[PDB]
């Protein structure tokens, strides 16, 4: 059927078969220039890589490594979307009736990688599937499955990593060690199209993590790191970033001293520590390590004392023996602080707060949940997802290159020097839309931003708003209802604070809810059509209700 | 700071 596609679409009367010559014109029609020229150069590298062209000796008379060659082909195919079809035919021509035993194998490797990193256009898809269908029984199903995967999970944003080239010769699946905050590391099977959403799902099913919202996948190399989220990014395309960093640093592409952590980035505005035990355990560890390192850094001593005391209850209980306490404190407190004063004053203060608060003498889970809740309150900014955003038009946010950190407390705009310029509660967020621009409207000021992640950052806020909205038991009245002889109805004025009395704002399927009026104190029936639910989980202050009018 | 997480290195955008 690829014969029929060539007969119909091949522009220069090009051979449907193998050629050992350059190409004077591209196989398909390209109205755009550059695409036209790129098609021919790509072709030159495909051939030089399959051995069908001699590689030069120390335009393209220039040499390159076969790795550099692959990167060239796949690279053009990603950056320029049209060539994606042309290139496939280019590797089909050379793989149809290729009688050199090695050239065939190299071509099919090139389909392994290219079918790893991008899709065909809609028009050409089925034909490619048929040509793969009559493949060698070795790579035949391999490439079909790689194409199904890639077609599902999107276009890779990077050319194949060295690790993938290995996987292609192996025709296998890739093992990857993911470090949990416990220090134990779960090894996961991964292919080219693997996504941090998928990987996090696998970690969940592995350690049984039911409350997964906010667990992200971080990647660390060479005293630098970034996040893959639980979102739709491809970790192979992070590993490629790391490789192209290591080659920049001079080490080998296969040197690869990178690592993947499974870490808690988010805290949801509805976060309940007592909901999941597993989450509480991983994020307990993550917290304590963070205190050891100085990531999570205390502003007041009593808080640190209380954390250490809790930790002792978790590891010790109501037994106070300074042989155990003076043993734990050096390991928990960071070096910088533990050196600041004597272990006698340290064990004495930890045991002091221990005796004071623990008078109940509480499951260890309870104390761990307590310290998780403590963390969530103390460090809203360190538990935020960070984005880079550049302001275009707004007042009160003068900066034009900024860092937006979204977290459970709200949106926070950050100075390049880390001072917070503008805070926003989600109750104050009147809309956030992506166009690569972003339109943020608050209750008072409207802004416009250009950030690359804008879609994502408009999505996350949406996820947080809807979340709150479904849990919101608070509402404001829109129109009035004057009281009647009917005492079933609830009186209210415009802008009243209606509390909706164990109606989660989720239940809007019904058109009636009952509640009480915060001003009146009267309690009665309200039409759900007169309610505007406020996305807060605590009673909204007068300050917030004056703005909402 | 926020951008520098001790033990993981520096972020990137």
């Amino acid at each position: 059927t690829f014969p029929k596609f060539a007969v119909t679409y091949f522009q220069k009367s090009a051979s449907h078969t193998h050629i050992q010559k350059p190409l004077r014109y591209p196989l398909l029609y390209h109205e755009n220039d550059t695409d036209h020229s790129a098609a021919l150069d790509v072709w030159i590298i495909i051939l030089r890589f399959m051995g069908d062209l001699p590689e030069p000796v120390v335009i393209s008379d220039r040499p390159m490594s076969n790795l550099e060659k692959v990167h060239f082909i796949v690279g053009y195919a990603i950056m320029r979307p049209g060539l994606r079809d042309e290139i496939y035919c280019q590797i089909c021509k050379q793989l149809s009736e290729n009688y050199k035993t090695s050239s065939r194998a190299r071509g099919w490797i090139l389909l392994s990688l290219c079918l790893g990193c991008f899709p065909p256009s809609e028009r050409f898809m089925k034909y490619l599937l048929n040509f793969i269908s009559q493949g060698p029984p070795s790579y035949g199903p391999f490439c079909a499955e790689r194409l199904q995967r890639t077609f599902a999970n999107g276009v890779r944003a990077e050319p194949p990593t060295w690790l993938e080239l290995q996987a292609v010769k192996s025709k296998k699946h890739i093992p990857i060690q993911v470090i949990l905050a416990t220090g134990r590391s779960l090894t996961i099977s991964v292919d080219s199209a693997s996504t941090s959403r998928e990987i996090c799902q696998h970690v969940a099913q592995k350690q049984g993590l039911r409350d997964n919202l906010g667990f992200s996948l971080q990647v660390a190399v060479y005293d630098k790191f970034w996040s893959l989220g639980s979102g739709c990014d491809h970790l192979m395309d992070a590993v490629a970033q790391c490789e192209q960093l290591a080659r920049e640093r001079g080490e080998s592409q296969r040197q690869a001293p990178w690592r993947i952590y499974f870490r808690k980035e988010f805290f949801t505005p509805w976060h309940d520590s007592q909901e999941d035990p597993v989450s509480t355990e991983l994020i307990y560890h993550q917290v304590l390590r963070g205190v050891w390192s100085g990531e999570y850094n205390f502003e007041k001593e009593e808080e640190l004392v209380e954390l250490l005391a809790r930790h002792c209850y978790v590891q010790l209980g109501a037994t106070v023996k300074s042989n155990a306490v003076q043993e734990l404190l050096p390991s928990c407190v960071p070096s910088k602080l533990y050196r600041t004063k004597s272990p006698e004053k340290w064990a004495s203060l930890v045991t002091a707060a221990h005796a004071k608060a623990q008078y109940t003498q509480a499951t260890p889970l309870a104390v761990r949940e307590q310290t998780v809740e403590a963390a969530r309150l103390l460090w809203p900014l360190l538990f935020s997802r960070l984005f880079e955003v550049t302001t275009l038009s707004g007042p009160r946010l003068p900066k034009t290159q900024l860092v937006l950190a979204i977290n459970w407390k709200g949106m926070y705009f950050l100075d390049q020097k880390e001072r917070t310029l503008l805070g926003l509660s989600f109750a104050e967020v009147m809309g956030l839309v992506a166009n690569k621009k972003l339109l943020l409207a608050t209750l008072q000021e409207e802004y416009e931003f250009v950030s690359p992640s804008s879609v994502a950052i408009a999505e996350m806020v949406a996820l947080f708003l809807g979340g709150l909205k479904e849990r919101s038991v608070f509402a404001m009245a829109l129109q009035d209802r004057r009281a009647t002889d009917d005492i079933t109805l609830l009186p209210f004025k415009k802008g009243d604070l209606l509390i909706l009395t164990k109606k989660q704002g989720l239940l809007a399927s019904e058109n009636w809810a009952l509640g009480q009026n915060d001003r009146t104190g009267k309690t009665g029936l309200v039409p759900t059509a007169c309610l505007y639910t406020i996305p807060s989980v605590t009673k909204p202050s007068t300050q917030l209700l004056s703005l909402l009018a | 700071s926020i951008l520098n997480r001790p033990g993981l290195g520096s972020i990137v955008f």
Side-chain angles (χ1 to χ4, degrees), chain A residues 1-3 5-10 13-20 22-23 25-30 34-47 49-58 60 63-67 70-78 81-83 85-92 94-96 98-99 101-103 105-121 124-125 127-133 135-145 147 149-155 157-168 170 173-176 178-183 185-196 198-200 202-204 207-209 211-217 219-222 225-240 242-243 245-246 248 250 252 256-263 265-273 275-288 290-298 303-314 316-320 322 324-325 328-335 337-338 340 342-343 346-355 357 360 362-387 389-395 397-398 400 402-415 420-435 438-445 447 449-458 460-468 470-480 483-484 486-492 495-501 504-509 511-521 523-527 529-538 540-542 544-549, chain B residues 1-4 6-13:
Chain A
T1 198
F2 165 70
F5 183 66
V7 167
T8 41
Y9 276 83
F10 273 21
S13 59
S15 296
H16 150 285
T17 40
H18 191 278
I19 315 180
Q20 284 215 39
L23 265 183
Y25 309 100
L27 293 184
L28 305 169
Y29 180 53
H30 304 250
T34 71
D35 286 39
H36 197 277
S37 177
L40 69 76
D41 304 65
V42 187
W43 159 266
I44 300 182
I45 281 138
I46 307 178
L47 270 67
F49 166 75
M50 297 175 64
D52 293 328
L53 275 190
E55 223 153 30
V57 157
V58 189
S60 303
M64 41 203 300
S65 65
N66 34 40
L67 179 75
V70 178
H71 277 246
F72 189 101
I73 313 175
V74 187
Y76 261 102
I78 302 176
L83 267 44
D85 251 350
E86 170 94 14
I87 293 183
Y88 274 133
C89 303
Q90 290 194 3
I91 327 175
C92 285
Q94 292 307 118
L95 272 192
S96 64
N98 188 346
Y99 302 114
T101 66
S102 80
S103 181
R106 282 146 165 279
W108 282 104
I109 288 178
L110 210 66
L111 249 70
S112 195
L113 296 166
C114 273
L115 284 186
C117 293
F118 60 104
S121 82
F124 176 76
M125 172 80 45
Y127 300 139
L128 183 41
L129 270 90
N130 167 227
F131 169 81
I132 309 168
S133 157
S138 44
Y139 299 161
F142 193 96
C143 286
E145 174 259 17
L147 183 68
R149 292 280 298 162
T150 298
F151 173 82
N153 289 8
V155 189
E158 282 251 320
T161 65
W162 180 93
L163 214 172
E164 292 163 284
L165 180 64
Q166 151 94 325
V168 177
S170 307
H173 269 235
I174 294 169
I176 283 175
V178 183
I179 292 193
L180 296 171
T182 71
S185 305
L186 297 178
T187 313
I188 299 184
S189 172
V190 156
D191 69 48
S192 179
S194 273
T195 284
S196 54
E198 299 172 349
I199 291 169
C200 292
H202 294 304
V203 180
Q207 247 190 355
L209 188 33
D211 165 36
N212 53 343
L213 261 279
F215 277 103
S216 291
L217 201 64
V219 171
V221 200
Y222 269 53
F225 93 109
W226 58 92
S227 170
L228 277 44
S230 96
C232 34
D233 312 349
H234 314 79
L235 91 168
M236 294 315 302
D237 286 32
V239 180
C242 313
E243 291 177 351
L245 178 64
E248 178 175 356
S252 176
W258 53 249
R259 37 222 162 78
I260 322 180
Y261 296 166
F262 182 91
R263 146 161 288 206
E265 192 168 57
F266 286 30
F267 263 132
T268 56
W270 50 87
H271 185 86
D272 196 349
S273 297
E275 190 164 318
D276 185 313
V278 194
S279 73
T280 303
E281 288 216 38
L282 294 74
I283 175 179
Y284 186 25
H285 285 105
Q286 173 173 334
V287 174
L288 275 173
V291 196
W292 181 11
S293 71
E295 177 172 17
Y296 311 128
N297 201 13
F298 281 72
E303 304 172 332
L304 213 181
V305 188
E306 287 296 342
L307 212 181
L308 305 172
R310 289 193 220 103
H311 197 177
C312 302
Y313 187 110
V314 183
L316 310 177
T319 83
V320 193
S322 301
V325 166
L328 275 202
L329 296 199
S331 56
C332 303
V333 187
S335 55
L337 297 191
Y338 189 82
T340 57
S342 166
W346 259 220
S348 83
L349 289 181
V350 172
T351 54
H354 178 94
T360 174
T363 73
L365 290 211
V367 199
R368 302 173 178 159
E369 302 167 343
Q370 275 205 60
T371 201
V372 169
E373 218 64 46
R376 182 187 65 105
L377 296 151
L378 264 164
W379 307 291
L381 280 181
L382 289 80
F383 278 80
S384 318
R385 194 180 170 210
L386 304 94
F387 296 118
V389 174
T390 41
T391 61
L392 295 206
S393 64
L397 200 60
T400 302
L402 279 187
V403 169
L404 162 63
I406 320 177
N407 55 50
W408 71 272
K409 231 191 223 169
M411 299 204 228
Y412 292 93
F413 287 98
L414 290 187
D415 211 6
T420 77
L421 309 173
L422 175 65
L424 300 176
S425 186
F426 303 104
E428 305 182 3
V429 175
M430 290 300 106
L432 187 63
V433 196
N435 311 340
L438 182 86
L439 295 163
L440 155 70
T442 78
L443 296 187
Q444 314 169 303
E445 298 166 301
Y447 295 60
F449 301 71
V450 189
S451 65
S453 312
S454 62
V455 188
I457 88 168
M460 200 218 308
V461 177
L463 190 68
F464 276 8
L465 281 157
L468 290 166
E470 150 181 345
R471 289 130 262 204
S472 171
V473 78
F474 311 86
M476 164 163 293
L478 305 192
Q479 46 264 27
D480 313 342
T484 322
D486 185 346
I487 198 50
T488 304
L489 274 293
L490 186 67
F492 50 80
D496 252 338
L497 174 53
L498 297 181
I499 309 176
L500 268 194
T501 56
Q504 224 163 252
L506 186 160
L507 306 81
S509 73
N511 70 343
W512 69 276
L514 65 89
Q516 64 172 21
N517 182 314
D518 191 25
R519 181 191 73 267
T520 319
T523 78
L525 285 193
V526 184
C530 296
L531 299 164
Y532 168 55
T533 39
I534 311 169
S536 196
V537 82
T538 52
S541 97
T542 51
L544 182 265
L545 291 155
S546 56
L547 312 191
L548 272 174
Chain B
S1 173
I2 311 176
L3 307 156
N4 281 304
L8 269 61
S10 168
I11 40 73
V12 82
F13 297 142

